[PDB]
Design a protein around this ligand. Sequence first.
Ligand SMILES: *[C@@H]1O[C@H](CO)[C@@H](O[C@@H]2O[C@H](CO)[C@@H](O[C@@H]3O[C@H](CO[C@H]4O[C@H](CO)[C@@H](O)[C@H](O)[C@@H]4O)[C@@H](O)[C@H](O)[C@@H]3O)[C@H](O)[C@H]2NC(C)=O)[C@H](O)[C@H]1NC(C)=O
Ligand SMILES: *[C@@H]1O[C@H](CO)[C@@H](O[C@@H]2O[C@H](CO)[C@@H](O[C@@H]3O[C@H](CO)[C@@H](O)[C@H](O)[C@@H]3O)[C@H](O)[C@H]2NC(C)=O)[C@H](O)[C@H]1NC(C)=O
Ligand code: UDP
Ligand code: UDP
Ligand code: NAG
Ligand code: NAG
Ligand code: MG
Ligand code: MG
Lengths: 318, 326
Amino acid sequence: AYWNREQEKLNRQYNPSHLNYCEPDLRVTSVVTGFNNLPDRFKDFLLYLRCRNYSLLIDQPDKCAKKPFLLLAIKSLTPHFARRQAIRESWGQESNAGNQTVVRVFLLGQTPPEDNHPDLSDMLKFESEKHQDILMWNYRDTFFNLSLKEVLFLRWVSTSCPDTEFVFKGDDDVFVNTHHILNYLNSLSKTKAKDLFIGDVIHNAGPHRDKKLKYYIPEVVYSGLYPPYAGGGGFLYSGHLALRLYHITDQVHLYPIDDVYTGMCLQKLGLVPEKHKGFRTFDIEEKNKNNICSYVDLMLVHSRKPQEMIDIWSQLQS
Amino acid sequence: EAYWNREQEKLNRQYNPILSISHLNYCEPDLRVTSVVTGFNNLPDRFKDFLLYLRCRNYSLLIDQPDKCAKKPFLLLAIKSLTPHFARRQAIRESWGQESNNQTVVRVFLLGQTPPEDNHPDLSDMLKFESEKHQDILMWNYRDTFFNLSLKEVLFLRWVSTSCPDTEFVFKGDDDVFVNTHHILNYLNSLSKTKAKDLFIGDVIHNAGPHRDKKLKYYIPEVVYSGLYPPYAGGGGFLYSGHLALRLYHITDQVHLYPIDDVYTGMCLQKLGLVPEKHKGFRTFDIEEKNKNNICSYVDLMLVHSRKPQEMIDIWSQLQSAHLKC
Ligand SMILES: *[C@@H]1O[C@H](CO)[C@@H](O[C@@H]2O[C@H](CO)[C@@H](O[C@@H]3O[C@H](CO[C@H]4O[C@H](CO)[C@@H](O)[C@H](O)[C@@H]4O)[C@@H](O)[C@H](O)[C@@H]3O)[C@H](O)[C@H]2NC(C)=O)[C@H](O)[C@H]1NC(C)=O
Ligand SMILES: *[C@@H]1O[C@H](CO)[C@@H](O[C@@H]2O[C@H](CO)[C@@H](O[C@@H]3O[C@H](CO)[C@@H](O)[C@H](O)[C@@H]3O)[C@H](O)[C@H]2NC(C)=O)[C@H](O)[C@H]1NC(C)=O
Ligand SMILES: O=c1ccn([C@@H]2O[C@H](COP(=O)(O)OP(=O)(O)O)[C@@H](O)[C@H]2O)c(=O)[nH]1
Ligand SMILES: O=c1ccn([C@@H]2O[C@H](COP(=O)(O)OP(=O)(O)O)[C@@H](O)[C@H]2O)c(=O)[nH]1
Ligand SMILES: *[C@@H]1O[C@H](CO)[C@@H](O)[C@H](O)[C@H]1NC(C)=O
Ligand SMILES: *[C@@H]1O[C@H](CO)[C@@H](O)[C@H](O)[C@H]1NC(C)=O
Ligand SMILES: [Mg+2]
Ligand SMILES: [Mg+2]
C-alpha cells in the first residue's frame, strides 16, 4: 500500500520534500497500480500529498488575546452561513464567566470557481468582519483535504492560541452541550487533564473496501487496520496535547480521513484516546429527540439542523 | 364536509350572485375553526396555523426592488427561496438566472420571514447585504413556510400587477432546479401572438388527488380538503405570459389560500376558464442517469429537478458550447 510504504520512508528520514513540494507528484501514477482507474479525489490526494505550506487568507490574530479556558474550533464550508450563525447564537457563544474564557473559530478552506462553486467571497468577508471568527486558508476545501484542515488548524493553535487550556474540534452539523463539556473539564483531576483526548473512540476499525461507501479506501492506498480514533462529529482535548499533536504532524503523512489522521498522530505520541459515551455520533433514539432531558447527559449529538440547534439550546437553558 | 371546500363554497356565493368577517385582511386568529374542524387539536401544527390565519393576506413588502422592471422585460425570472439559501441564489445569478439584454431578462427571488421566534438563525444582516449588492431580493413580512407558499404566490402576483405589469412573460420556479434559459427564450420567440397571449405551460397533471398518507410531505386530511385537484403545473417551475399574470392576480381574492402553492395556482387558472398545458421540457423527475453526463441532454429541455449550486454552474458552462457538440 502506498501510504504504508511512504510512512515507512518518512520514519527513516526523521531518524537519520514532503512538506513544501507543491508540484504534482507525477511518480504516484506509476507506483500506484490502477492509478488511472481511481476516483478523482484519490488522484488529487496522491498527486498533492506532499504539499502543506498553505497560507492563511483570513486570520483572527487576537482571538486568544486573553488565555482561553476552552477553544471551540468548528469545521465548515463557505456556503454554510446558516450553520455557523446558529452555532454563534447557541452552543458556540463566546463567554467569560468565572474567568473561564470561551472563544470560537470556524475553519474554512477555499471553494474555488474552478470547482464550479458560486462566488460567495464578498458574503464571507462581510461575515468575517461582522463576527470576527473566520479562519480561512488558501487550499481546496474537500473531504480528503480535511487532515490538511487539521494540520493547518493545529499550526494556528501553536502560533496564535498556544495557551488555551482545552480544545474542542467538531463539525458544523452537530449539537454540542457546551455546559456539559465545561462541567466535565472542571471536574478533571490534573493527571487526566494534562493529556486529555476523548470522543467516540472505536478500536480495531479498518478501511472500508466497498467502493460505494463515503469513506472507501482502496487496498493500494492503505493496508492493515486503523489506530484507535475518535470520530463521528467531534472530540475534546487539552491545549498541552494540541502542541504535542502539531509537533508530530510533520512525521505523519496526511491521510484522506481526518479523524484517522489524528488517531495516527496520537498513536505516534504513545497515547490512546478514551471513549466517552456522551458522544452520540449515531444520534439518540427516535422518541427522545424532542425530550430536552435526553440532551442533559451527553456531550454532542449528530446531527442537527441550524433551527434545531437553536431550539435545543433554548430549552437547555432551563 | 371538508373545511376548505365549504369555505370556498361560501366565497363562490359572495362573488357569484347567480348562485343566490373579511377573508382577506382578518389577521387575528380565527378561533371559530377550533370547533368547526373536527379533530382540530390533533392536527399537525402546520394545519392549525394554516386554518387559524387563513383569512389574512395583506402582508407588507419589507425589501422591494421597485425599479426592477423600469425597462419593459421580455422575461421575468421569479425564484422561490428561503433566507439561508445564499449558495442557491448566487449559483442561479451566475448561471441560468443572469439578467441580460433588446429582450430584457430580469430576476427576483421571492422570500418571506425566517423569524427568530421560530428558532431560525438571525441572517437578516447577510440578507440586507445581499439585497444591496444584487438588487434582486423581494421579501414580505410573513412566516415563510411550505404551507404559506400559496401566500408567496399571491403576494408575488400582487407585486407583478403593481411593479412589473408590462413584462411579456413570467417564469416562476424553485431555487434547486436548473433552467435552460436559452431554450425558454427560443421557445417564447417562436410563439404566435395568439398562443402567447394566454400561455401557461409546465409539468401539468390532471385528476390528481390529495395525499391521505399522514407520513407524506404533501399529506392533506379529509377534514381539510375533499375531492380531486384541478389541473395544475408543479414540480419545480412553470412559464406564463404577463397578461395572464395580471388576470391571475385579479382572481386570487376569489380563491381561499391552500397549503400547496401549485394547487392554488391551478385553482386560479380553472376559475379563469383556462387549462394549463403540459410541455415535455419540464423534467421535474430529472433525466436518465447516463444522460446526466451528456450536455446534449440539456439543450432541448426547459428545466431539470433537481441540481445543486455547483451542478448549476457546471451545466450552464458546458451548455454555452453544446451547439458545437450536439
Ligand atoms: C403564514 O404566515 C403568517 C404571518 O407570518 C403566520 O401568521 C402568524 O402565526 C403566528 C403563529 O405561528 C401568530 O403568532 C401567534 O399569535 C397568537 C395571538 O397573539 C395575539 O394575541 C396575543 C394575546 O392573546 C397578544 O399578546 C399578541 O400581541 C397578539 O395580538 C399568540 O397567542 C401565539 O403565541 C403566537 O404569538 C401570528 O399572530 C400570525 N401573524 C399574523 C400577522 O397573522 C402563519 O402562522 C403562517 N402560516 C403557516 C401555515 O405557517
Ligand atoms: C487539497 O488542496 C490542494 C490545494 O488547493 C489541492 O491542490 C491543487 O489541486 C489542483 C487540482 O485539483 C491543482 O490545479 C491543477 O494543476 C495542474 C498542474 O498540471 C493542472 O494540470 C490542472 O489543470 C489544475 O490547474 C493545483 O495546482 C493544486 N494546488 C497546489 C498548491 O498544489 C488538492 O487538489 C486538494 N486535494 C484534494 C484531495 O482535494
Ligand atoms: O469538504 C468539506 C466537507 C465537509 N467539511 C466539514 O466536515 C464536517 C462533517 O462533514 P459531513 O457531515 O458531510 O461528514 P460525515 O458526518 O458524513 O462524516 C462538517 O462540519 C462539514 O462542514 C469540510 O469542512 N469540508
Ligand atoms: O418554506 C419554504 C420552503 C420551500 N421554499 C421553496 O420552495 C421550493 C421547492 O421546495 P422543495 O424543493 O424543498 O420541495 P419539493 O416540492 O421539491 O419536495 C424551493 O425553491 C424552496 O426554496 C420556500 O420558498 N419556502
Ligand atoms: C510552499 O513551498 C514551496 C517551496 O518549498 C513554494 O513553491 C510554494 O509557493 C509554497 N507555498 C504554497 C502555497 O504551496
Ligand atoms: C390587514 O388589514 C387589517 C385591517 O385593515 C389590519 O388590522 C391588519 O393589521 C393588516 N395586516 C397586516 C398589515 O399584516
Ligand atoms: Mg455529519
Ligand atoms: Mg425541490
